[PDB]
């Protein structure tokens, strides 16, 4: 049988969780930036990031189904103890990083929805109910959650689809932007945003989810007829799930690039006064450009297209916040299960991630204002960017060795493509790390920064060397 909807339906379910794992509030903010910084021109990189991410997903599905152990478990059996644990903490930092920008995303959504009545720190404390929810599920132990993901995608698409219809962007521009890569006259900050988007799309821990989710399904490893079909249908399920997420992502970028591109602060202030929305003093009266964030972007969108659009945007962010949390605990539970072989319930994982995440976030909210609160999102975005490759070297390093993947190793073209990719990502990171070091130019603060940079480069180079032997 070439293809059958019956086999698809019987082998679905990993795509549902994978889809929502690709729309964390970090990604929405990442797609938000291109809407007012680069417009439609920087849209093709989104497709390239998704396409590479999908190609990485198929490797996660291959590794997950070829051997019963997921990628975290097989990581425990390959690297030495010191590289294992240091990698273990490195990937963990992504989950705390992922949960950190989520609570900023959720808190901002509360503040916009509450017309400023509920304060910022109120939003930060309002996500503790998410932890309370996770405890309640653990007591009940439903353990299915597939309807939650399906509904969560449904509200996401409906909310952002309403945004796309209301904005009504020109289909010519988005088609010309997506299918024709063009990006000229850019400096280091522009490519810095470019690497930010590709890092934000390919989240490092999504490989662990797919490996574990594929492992859940039962399949005869020894017999070669079951694994090939299971691999094919899981790959096609990833393609559908990734296509839906990318369609939603292109919805947001096209929405924010149509009307919020090249608009000075005077014009948006003028329309805000005409609409008489109370949130009008945020934009200063000057000739300078417009800067967009979750708080500001929702405000101007509400000014331009009524409070209805703002509230729908706030709801959409909240759905993203819930999605990032659910994939956050799922990622954290599986990695700790595999790497150091520790069994912890989901309630333990969310409590650890949330309690660590809200400690700085509530403090900066009390001390600094909301503009700096979204300013911290820059720090998380770049930190996630330097640690983006840690999802690349491990996946092919492990899905390249003959003993571990049996005779289902990747073809020659896949190996050379990965080798080019890791070299490209290594060169980009070493290019950026020296620039970030030069930014400070201190005497001893540069020393500790240099020591950290030396350690991270040594880890990255060792993984790269391991990949080269593997390939």
């Amino acid at each position: 049988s070439c293809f059958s909807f019956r086999k698809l339906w019987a082998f679905t379910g990993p795509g549902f969780l994978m889809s929502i794992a690709y729309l964390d509030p970090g990604n929405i903010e990442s797609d938000l930036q291109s809407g007012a910084v680069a417009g439609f021109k920087l849209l093709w990189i989104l497709l390239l990031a998704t396409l590479v991410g999908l190609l990485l997903q198929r490797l996660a599905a291959r590794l997950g189904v070829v051997t019963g152990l997921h990628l975290a478990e097989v990581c425990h059996r390959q690297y030495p103890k010191v590289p294992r644990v240091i990698l273990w903490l490195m990937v963990e930092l992504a989950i705390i990083g992922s949960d950190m920008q989520e609570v900023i995303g959720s808190a901002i959504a509360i503040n916009l929805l509450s017309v400023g009545r509920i304060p910022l720190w109120g939003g930060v404390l309002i996500t503790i109910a998410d932890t309370f929810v996770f405890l309640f599920l653990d007591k009940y132990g439903l353990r299915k959650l597939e309807a939650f993901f399906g509904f969560l995608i449904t509200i996401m698409a409906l909310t952002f689809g309403y945004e796309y219809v209301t904005v009504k962007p020109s289909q010519s521009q988005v088609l010309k932007g997506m299918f024709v890569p063009s990006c000229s006259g850019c400096r280091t900050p522009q490519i810095e945003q470019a690497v930010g988007i590709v890092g934000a799309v390919i989240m490092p821990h999504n490989m662990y989810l797919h490996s574990a989710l594929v492992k859940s399904r039962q399949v005869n490893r020894n017999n070669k007829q079951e694994v090939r079909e299971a691999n094919k249908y899981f790959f096609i399920e990833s393609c559908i799930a990734l296509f839906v997420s990318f369609i939603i992502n292109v919805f947001v970028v096209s929405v924010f690039a149509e009307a919020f591109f090249g608009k000075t602060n005077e014009q948006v202030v003028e329309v805000c006064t005409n609409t008489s929305s109370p949130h009008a003093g945020l934009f200063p009266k000057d000739n300078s450009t417009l800067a967009v964030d979750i708080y500001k972007g929702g405000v101007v969108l509400g000014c331009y297209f009524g409070p209805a659009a703002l509230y729908i945007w706030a709801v959409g962010i909240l759905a993203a916040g819930q999605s990032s949390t659910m994939t956050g605990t799922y990622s954290g539970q599986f990695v700790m299960e595999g790497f150091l072989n520790l069994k912890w319930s989901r309630f333990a994982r969310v409590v650890l991630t949330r309690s660590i995440a809200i400690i700085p976030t509530l403090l900066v909210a009390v001390f600094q204002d909301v503009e700096h609160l979204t300013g911290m999102n820059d720090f998380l975005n770049v930190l996630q960017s330097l640690q983006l490759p840690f999802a690349l070297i491990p996946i092919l390093t492990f899905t390249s060795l003959r003993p571990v993947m049996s005779d289902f190793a990747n073809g020659l073209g896949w190996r050379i493509a990965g080798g080019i990719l890791v070299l490209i990502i290594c060169s980009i990171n070493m290019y950026f790390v020296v620039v970030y070091v030069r930014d400070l130019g201190h005497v001893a603060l540069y020393v500790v920064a240099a020591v950290v940079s030396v350690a991270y480069l040594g880890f990255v180079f060792y993984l790269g060397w391991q990949c080269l032997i593997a390939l």
Partner: nanobody, 120 residues
Framework: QVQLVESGGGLVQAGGSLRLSCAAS????????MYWYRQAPGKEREWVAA????????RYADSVKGRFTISRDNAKNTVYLQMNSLKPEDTAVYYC??????????????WGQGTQVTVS
């Protein structure tokens, strides 16, 4: 369909200041890169500066940095140069050019009508 008209030509003494404008219509100039040129008498056309606007970045040529400033008003669909401390070597025919990639592998160049600027 592409149209560009330059306004702000004339005679100015060395060390003066003046503001030049390219006004264009028929396309969304806000979304497209904007380049600027000057053709000195007896010399070839040369890259002066351009507002690519992918991040509202402004790039200047070597003999231009620190002396000329650029701005744009997409509301008026127009671009402005403010030139200060004009030196006698600045004498040239000034032209406004739009580089529409065409979403293909070849670009198309459209020039304005050309304004003459004189420096003593």
């Amino acid at each position: 369909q592409v149209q560009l008209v330059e306004s702000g030509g004339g005679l100015v003494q060395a060390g003066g200041s003046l503001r030049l404008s390219c006004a264009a219509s028929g396309f969304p100039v806000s979304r497209s890169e904007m380049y600027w040129y000057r053709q000195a008498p007896g010399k070839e056309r040369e890259w002066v500066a351009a507002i690519h606007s992918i991040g509202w970045n402004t790039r200047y040529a070597d003999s231009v940095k620190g002396r000329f400033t650029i701005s744009r008003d997409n509301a008026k669909n127009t671009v402005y140069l403010q030139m200060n401390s004009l030196k006698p070597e600045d004498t040239a025919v000034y032209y406004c050019n739009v580089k529409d990639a065409g979403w293909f592998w070849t670009n198309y160049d459209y020039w304005g009508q050309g304004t003459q600027v004189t420096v003593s």
